[PDB]
Design a protein around this ligand. Structure first.
Ligand code: HEM
Ligand code: B9R
Length: 392
């Protein structure tokens, strides 16, 4: 089997092999950096199957040496479960993580975006849209929603990479940092259990205590992945989307002249940005399934290359082009099926507010350096810039 990943990810460049695989051999056997060999899955149609079909299981990974890019299997909480356990956590979260709760955050999210831009302007150009905007924006928002104090970022931020590192941390460092984050969240739950605030951890603890619906460990691990998704995934998608807009100035011009395009722009950025560096978490077949002429037998794993599905020309016309006017856009950037992203309404709100605020307050915003001088963060399961210097 081919060794996978075929090539380490570069900037937002997509490996040309995916297009070749989608054309000529959409499912290919590979050997993974860690765990069992796997079937790499590349097409949109097969991606929906392995993410949503009940014959593909996440919970069965725990009974294998899970095919993976990370030295140890990730503690993915709800994203590691099947029904019924999955249903139990999903339902608790749906009941507390409501559309109303998110939409009610809108004034505070808009205010935080304005405050960060006030600071950028006060500090003078060039500013860093990563550490000076995307990171503290995403961080304050998820911290406010979850009830993790943003003032604790200095302690907890250095543990998050353990949930994402592929090539750049040892087993022992990952275990230690995973334990630190879980232990940190566990102590916060003792406080929020005694002294509830208007945040997700408080309401999760209350709903769970009152129905004996979740173990402490399950609560800790679930709150932990919510922190990572809000802090790391949002800021990564946001900074990558800014790079795409800067490098497609014609589309950026169109967005500023027709702001009603912003909802569709956010969806096109979800599809076009190859945010996931390679694949999301593996699933295992419960029965034989044929995908694209390749037989995946029971007990074998599949790797969902979501970014490749989002570049599937059989689904998106000119899929290799960023077009923020695109109307047909069944992208899988928020997943699909049972494990589809519960945070997508919030992520969409954050993306819209952040891009609208920057374009309205900083109309002349532009990248301060050639795209070739940028430093990207390597060795993680998602792509992000370390710095995005800008002028206005
Ligand atoms: C731009 C931002 C985000 C992107 C691109 C994103 C992407 C995704 C994707 C692709 C999945 C499915 C993974 C798979 O099936 O292997 C997922 C699941 C999930 N996401 Fe998001 N996410 C984002 C933000 C968030 C936020 C802000 C939260 C919560 C605060 C969140 C919470 C979750 C949860 C809990 C799941 C698992 C749901 C389940 O297993 O039923 N995400 N996300
Ligand atoms: C490769 N998997 C991607 C990722 O960034 N995963 C990260 C790093 O492994 C962990 C994570 C982010 N959002 C989560 C939600 C629930 C459990 C785990 C995570 C996708 C999840 C985007």
């Amino acid at each position: 089997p081919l060794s996978y990943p075929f090539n380490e990810a570069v900037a937002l460049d997509v490996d040309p092999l995916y297009a070749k695989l989608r054309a000529e051999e959409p499912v290919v056997r590979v050997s993974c950096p860690f765990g069992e060999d796997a079937w790499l899955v590349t097409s949109h149609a097969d991606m929906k199957t392995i993410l949503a079909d009940p014959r593909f299981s996440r919970a069965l990974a725990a009974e294998h040496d899970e095919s993976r890019l990370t030295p140890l299997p990730i503690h993915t909480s709800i994203l590691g479960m099947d029904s019924p356990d999955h249903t139990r956590l999903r339902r608790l979260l749906a009941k507390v993580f409501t559309m109303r709760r998110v939409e009610l955050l809108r004034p505070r999210i808009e205010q935080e975006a304005d405050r960060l831009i006030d600071a950028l302007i006060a500090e003078g150009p060039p500013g860093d849209l990563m550490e000076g905007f995307a990171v503290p924006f995403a961080g304050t928002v998820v911290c406010d929603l979850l009830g993790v104090p943003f003032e604790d970022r200095e302690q907890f931020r250095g543990w998050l990479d353990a949930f994402s590192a592929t090539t750049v941390m040892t087993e022992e460092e990952i275990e230690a940092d995973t334990e630190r984050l879980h232990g940190y969240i566990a102590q916060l739950m003792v406080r929020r259990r005694a002294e509830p605030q208007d945040d997700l951890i408080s309401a999760m603890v209350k709903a769970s205590d009152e129905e004996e619906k979740l173990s402490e460990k399950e609560l800790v691990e679930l709150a932990s992945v919510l922190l990572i998704a809000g802090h790391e995934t949002v800021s990564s998608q946001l900074i990558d989307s800014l790079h795409v807009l800067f490098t497609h100035p014609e589309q950026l011009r169109l967005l500023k002249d027709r702001p009603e395009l912003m909802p569709g722009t956010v969806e096109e950025l979800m599809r076009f940005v190859p945010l996931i560096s390679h694949v999301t978490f593996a699933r295992y077949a419960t029965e034989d399934v044929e995908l694209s002429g390749t037989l995946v037998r029971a007990g074998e794993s599949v790797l969902p290359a979501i970014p490749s599905a989002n570049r599937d020309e059989s689904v998106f016309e000119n899929a290799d082009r960023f077009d923020l006017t695109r109307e047909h856009n069944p992208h899988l950037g928020f997943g699909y099926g049972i494990h589809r992203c519960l945070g997508a309404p919030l992520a969409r709100l954050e993306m819209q507010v952040a891009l609208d605020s920057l374009l309205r307050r900083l109309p002349e915003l532009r990248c301060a350096v050639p795209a070739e001088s940028l430093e990207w963060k390597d060795g993680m399961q998602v792509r992000s810039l370390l710095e995005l210097p800008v002028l206005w």
